[PDB]
């Protein structure tokens, strides 16, 4: 039954298709903002490109996190998913996997445009796409406790960021260290291995602590 | 007079239905002549060589990507004062066309700047201004598509169109001053040799006609979308067969 | 009167052949996408009205069954 | 014994003591109706029996075991309908009802949606439907569900009279084979006083 | 029962996830695989573990190219050059094209096999875009031993 | 009666004071993000501090922007505020001014700390404080249409950013150009003059295009 | 002539024609009641009459002039109480009522909040109050307003019978002099039929 | 036993009531003697000179900035398994004290870093880790304030305290590795010259006692917040006089 | 046994005095603020319960007037 929830969340997201592009348009906004401030200088942009790419990724995923749970509270679907005959960790896992298929995959297909926009080479795009693939699920699993905690609040837009961003700090450091090593043409196997380790750890632990928060917010 | 009869949504539907074929064929004729007498039967720039033909594929894609937005304001203005709903459907009708023209302008500018600059994207003032224009088009489209009620979506889209039009000279001159401060640019958009000028103007008018055709057709699409229950679409579909 | 003497040389625009045809193709594609999207949208709205009004005719049939 | 037993449930919503010391046991095949006075708090009571809300004091029991342990067997035998219908407005009625178990084939689909009064509105999107007809897809979930426990938080809201008689007929039919329906309604209901049982959360 | 089945299945998922987490952490800490030595760490062993490099193990050496140590074979792509830290110096033999970034007095990293007598048969030489860059271990080697001149670490045979 | 609305909005915001600090904590987290990615190198951080400061300021104000109108829809106050015997432009002006006294003054008093964190000198702090003072009112007036239309939505978190930030691009360019002309010691009077000109223009034009916006968003 | 007058009011919420062609003129000193049949759509009429919602076609007039022009005089003579009470839950009851005009001094404060049933609960924050007592602050605004026109979307929602009696007595007192109250309510109200007038929005 | 009676809210109120004064006086004595033996009657480090006394005002302010959070974890754990509401109240009691200790540790670290680095904030690993810890404390406090119901706010705070403690060693070692590359750092926090050791330990124990006193008193504050109506407070206040 | 020979020299801690005394003041103030807020909050809650119970006694007196 775990796949039915995932497939249905994919169907509801794909019914209106326009709304899933707004995270990547916000990603392009934050992509655009910095070189307006800094300047069109290509060496400075080439060196700072990890900072713009991952701060944009964190903020785009973070603003996309509202669609993960805010819809089903008002529709009442969240309750009916909690009394489904299946442990609520699996329900959370299905929702976060659908959210990554709906928020992270647009960034991964959008990755050639941003890679050509800032000026990284094909190795830079390769490392940045692999690092996005290993990192944006971790954005989903660290954002799920914050959204589950802040779904009852009417004003839950700043505080959700306040909770999620210190959790995503280690992923920030390893991702930007990985692509800093990539711009110098070094092998980035170890950084991606730590990245997959954080992915597996958060994927294991985050449903079990999002389910309790989700039980907390509804009651 | 008949301008007041240009407000009844069915009458506007057969007016657009009658204006679609002729204007579309005139568009294809004018644009075919423009490209066939511009990408061939035409000289080339001395320094750029044979890469100057892109000045066709960019400049109707640029100016009208502004011009549609300017025309958008007119519709939005008709949406705010006289409270004409069909103008507020016209805003949503032209918004994807303006977005696509802007995206074409960005892509042609990048493909033009690669044989000069060495890279696909140098933050030139023109291309950054076009990127901000594309962002405003995306804002209008997402405003029209996030709402549930279509009428209120069109009126809201008109509101952000007027906001964008007021803020657009500020954005364009601020971006132009941004390139003035840091580092200059070459002569790219409208620094054009004679006898290659008529093809650009013919392509300008052809892109105008194609934008008018697409606008006049998505107007029918939106009118059919809202009046899905009133008996005139019933009479039209029983006429179909 | 063509500047390009050879018709085969026309497709290779003086060494700068990739960029011109790249933007030609990626201009032709979005216009085709717009035209196809709007035409299939018009057809889809018309067929949706057709299905809705056939279902309204079935509502009339149900009303006639209730009346009879 | 009876499966659903409530023992000394105490609830404070925003430091207002809604009810205290309330304890009621339900044997198989009764049709308890909550008859409380205040608008909010009987809804909190139904959420307290369904397991959405933890008891602040006391416990709810299903077949002799507390609700924090027997979730995977309790949720196999319940159907909960809130004030909100619990469905997705974006999907159509048929896929929303197909999300819940079975549906699909005609043995469990296209007459369940008909007996709620939504015959002929199966494939319309939900957001283009009236609010009562939006509640009628979740209310149509009754005819296909095998759960012995049904819990209903105003089922008869914006429902025409013939709908209410059909729902009460199917509902008493559920009551026959040992099925328990716990519900709150505002309207005076047209069922005999001998069959029903009233638990009032007084004060 | 169904409770035991659900708990056991999700616990199997939990232990698989934790095992793969620990596996990738230990892999990455091992995928540091610090074959990056300095010439002083070749001659006198690594500073922390005192382990000697063996003859014939594939390895990586960061060091500055000495002024006047690059002799190129005129008839082949064979280049022999000596690279140093501020603690020691090692010879390098490389067959192939050198990078255009390779100049004397600049930092390079040599991937190759160690021969007898602190000699390295390079399979690859990586010279950096930055003329003044020193690798972190090599930079700490010269900060510890206080910037002794390249002529001092030119081994006086050379 | 323009002042009673302003004083009441201050009383509501100051009655629970904690929520006011959440914009500046989001600001501080965004300042924390770019040193961790780019690096602790002080020459680069000193060069890039205008871009970090203004991307943080735009995003902090933009997420703070929800409290400008989202509270009054559910409480029903906003309808009554349109039915005060006062033109709704004045009501909008009072709310945006109270929001600036609630969102922007925390940034202006936090200004020494973020100036300390990024290595700017006393002249850099003076220009940074004056430029925030002349810019965050303009942030309020440009974001008031975005909040005004995106108050009726359930999903108004990414769309609000998409409408607001391209409007605030000229403020980005002029503010960070003033900051670049301040880091190298040149006088900065003309840049603040342009900032004041935009502030005057948007303060003139934003209530009149926010009132009809707020009339559409609820009917 | 009558001051509040409606001409050919048609409304289409989400492409559903709730009403069309409704046109009614209201002379001073009348207590018309909006009957209605659907739950939502009479609230839409009330919001359309106060001018929150524009007519899609047709127009509302106050004293012979359309509502898009005479706002500064219309809003000075109206009191609107929707389903939401319109008060801030963060502030106290007395300060919420003092936001609205007059109040303050004891000639217009501390009996207006008393006659609605909130005697002794003046200084408690609104968020620690029951929902009926939250609505009774906006209901307490009636005793201090100078507005001739009162428009009410469900004024009697969770108020006891004594509060309803007091509200109707004050409302009749307003009806004696020049002033129109328009209200919508579920409950059958205890005033004689001769005084009241019913405009029902037929389907 | 009496541990079960420890969960009774009035009984904990008088337990905290008689535990505040003695513990507070002891705290004052130990922390006072610690500072006077540390700031004088003690040597100073040879290289940094007399700026080394700051190692008191930082290091009890640093370690307990983690320690309170670790203790917060324990309370949060008691919140989730045994469902004791008072441990979730202890989380909210101990979050502001941890935040203030973290603020003291951070900006005293900046005051120590000025005579060495020349700037108030060189992005050292220790100050960055304490800044992230401060952000975690602010997240806990903001969750405790945003919610309306105090019990639900405490339970939400317990959830995020367990989240933060799960992810906190990852943050600390990632920041430590973040200045493994990108330059290094000196030996400052716990490189201590002997006989300047007992004052620092005694100040650690004094900061422990002060944290316990403030924790035990904001315990009483939040108890009086939650149980504002039940008659044990009534008997207490009629006993007041 | 004091390292600083002069008591006046102890106030000027070997030149590095501004940083140390700035920090001493900057740790004394927030702990004092925490204790002041923690005392004033307890006093304020007790006085708020006092006002609430005076109003409750007024409520009981009003009930007595309604009974009489």
Author numbering:
A (entry chain B), F (entry chain b): 2 to 220
B (entry chain c), H (entry chain C): 3 to 243
C (entry chain d), I (entry chain D): 2 to 69
D (entry chain A), G (entry chain a): 1 to 203
E (entry chain E): 2 to 159
Quote from the publication.
Here we report cryo-electron microscopic structures of the heme translocation complex CcmABCD from E. coli, alone and bound to the heme chaperone CcmE. CcmABCD forms a heterooctameric complex centered around the ABC transporter CcmAB that does not by itself transport heme. Our data suggest that the complex flops a heme group from the inner to the outer leaflet at its CcmBC interfaces, driven by ATP hydrolysis at CcmA. A conserved heme-handling motif (WxWD) at the periplasmic side of CcmC rotates the heme by 90° for covalent attachment to the heme chaperone CcmE that we find interacting exclusively with the CcmB subunit.
In our cryo-EM single particle data of the native complex, the two most highly resolved 3D classes contained the Ccm(ABCD)2 complex, but one of these additionally featured a prominent periplasmic domain that after refinement was modeled as CcmE with its N-terminal transmembrane helix. This helix interacted exclusively with helix hVI of CcmB, with the periplasmic domain of CcmE poised above the CcmBC interface on one side of the complex. Although the observed interface was small, the interaction of CcmB with CcmE was well resolved in the maps. 29 % of all particles used for the final refinement contained CcmE, and although at lower contour levels a second copy of the chaperone on the opposite side of the complex was apparent and the N-terminal helix of CcmE was visible in lower-resolution reconstructions during data processing, the relevant class predominantly contained a single copy of CcmE, with slightly lower local resolution and presumably substoichiometric occupancy. The transmembrane helix of CcmE was modeled from residue N2 to S32 and is followed by a short, flexible hinge preceding the β-barrel domain that commences at F37. The heme-coordinating residues H130 and Y134 faced the membrane but were situated above CcmB rather than CcmC. The association of CcmE to the complex also did not seem to affect its structure, and there was no discernible change observed in CcmB. In the experimental structure, the periplasmic domain of CcmE showed enhanced mobility and a lower local resolution than the core complex, which in the absence of a bound heme group is not surprising. AlphaFold2 yielded a model of a symmetric Ccm(ABCDE)2 complex with a root-mean-squared deviation from the experimental structure of 3.1 Å for all atoms that also reproduced the observed association of CcmE to the heterooctameric core very well. However, the periplasmic domain of CcmE was rotated by about 90° towards CcmC, placing it above loop 5 and the WxWD motif of the latter.
